Ligand binder design. Structure first.
Ligand SMILES: Nc1ncnc2c1ncn2[C@@H]1O[C@H](C[C@@H](N)CC[C@H](N)C(=O)O)[C@@H](O)[C@H]1O
Length: 248
């Protein structure tokens, strides 16, 4: 579809809205002092607006503008353009929308202590590693996808913290361990296969916070973790998602 952009507010353009609808507009939106009228394709209109075809980037921008802060006690996840006047610890992330990220942030605040060394396995946007530094920990975020590293680095900087970010997985992290705590938002079968190496990555008394787990698959993780010598400490869920916390 195409947009016809006009300078002005809906209130000011009121006189010509009927004409835009007669001309076939199916949608209208006031967007920062401009009225955008949406059509299947350009048609002849006397209003002196400008036609432009709508693309995926326009959809992304519109969606972005509709984003609001997301609470994840003790944190609040904010888009770089959000302002927040609450008590919550801010976590600025270039567009924390998932249940699992939320479970992970709340669990992290409980199990992480100032001065703890943290491994955020499958760091992605770097949100967990960033929250760990904000809580007084020292974190390493690793991801097998090199492409996420630059955005993670940039989110860190926006948050005034500096975790270490590295391409790779668990084996790549070992030289920097052992760690006091590992947080891994992955999926149940992967946790199950890594259980033995999770034990190796942590110091005695260390903690493993596992999420990205569907309720129907929780059994797999309980079994592999018990099998690996971990003791369960806490469980929490949101929707169909579960976080399981263990001590080594
Ligand atoms: N085996 C693996 N080792 C390291 N990273 C992985 C592995 N498998 C998947 N990943 C990354 O794990 C991340 C999973 C994300 N859902 C987690 C992002 C972030 N930690 C969060 O809680 O929101 C993705 O960025 C994957 O690229």
């Amino acid at each position: 579809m195409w947009v016809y952009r006009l300078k002005g507010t809906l209130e000011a353009l009121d006189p010509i809205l009927p004409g835009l609808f007669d001309g076939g507009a199916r949608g209208l939106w006031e967007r920062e002092g401009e009225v955008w009228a949406f059509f299947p394709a350009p048609v002849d209109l006397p209003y002196e607006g400008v036609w432009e075809e709508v693309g995926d980037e326009d959809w992304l921008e519109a969606w972005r503008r509709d984003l609001k802060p997301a609470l994840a006690p003790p944190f609040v996840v904010l888009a770089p353009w959000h302002t927040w006047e609450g008590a919550e610890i801010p976590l600025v992330i270039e567009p924390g929308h998932h249940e699992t990220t939320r479970l992970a942030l709340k669990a992290l605040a409980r199990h992480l202590r100032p001065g703890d060394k943290v491994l955020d396995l499958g760091t992605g946007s770097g949100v967990l590693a960033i929250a760990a530094e904000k809580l007084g920990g020292k974190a390493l975020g690793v991801d097998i996808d090199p492409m996420v590293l630059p955005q993670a680095e940039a989110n860190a900087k926006r948050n005034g913290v500096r975790p270490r970010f590295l391409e790779g997985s668990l084996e790549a992290a070992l030289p920097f361990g052992p760690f006091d705590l590992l947080v891994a938002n992955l999926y149940a079968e992967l946790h199950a296969a890594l259980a033995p190496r999770y034990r190796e990555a942590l110091v005695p008394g260390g903690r493993a916070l596992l999420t990205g787990i569907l309720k129907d698959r929780a059994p797999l993780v309980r079994e592999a973790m018990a099998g690996a010598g971990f003791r369960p400490l806490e469980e929490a869920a949101e929707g169909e998602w579960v976080l399981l916390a263990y001590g080594r």
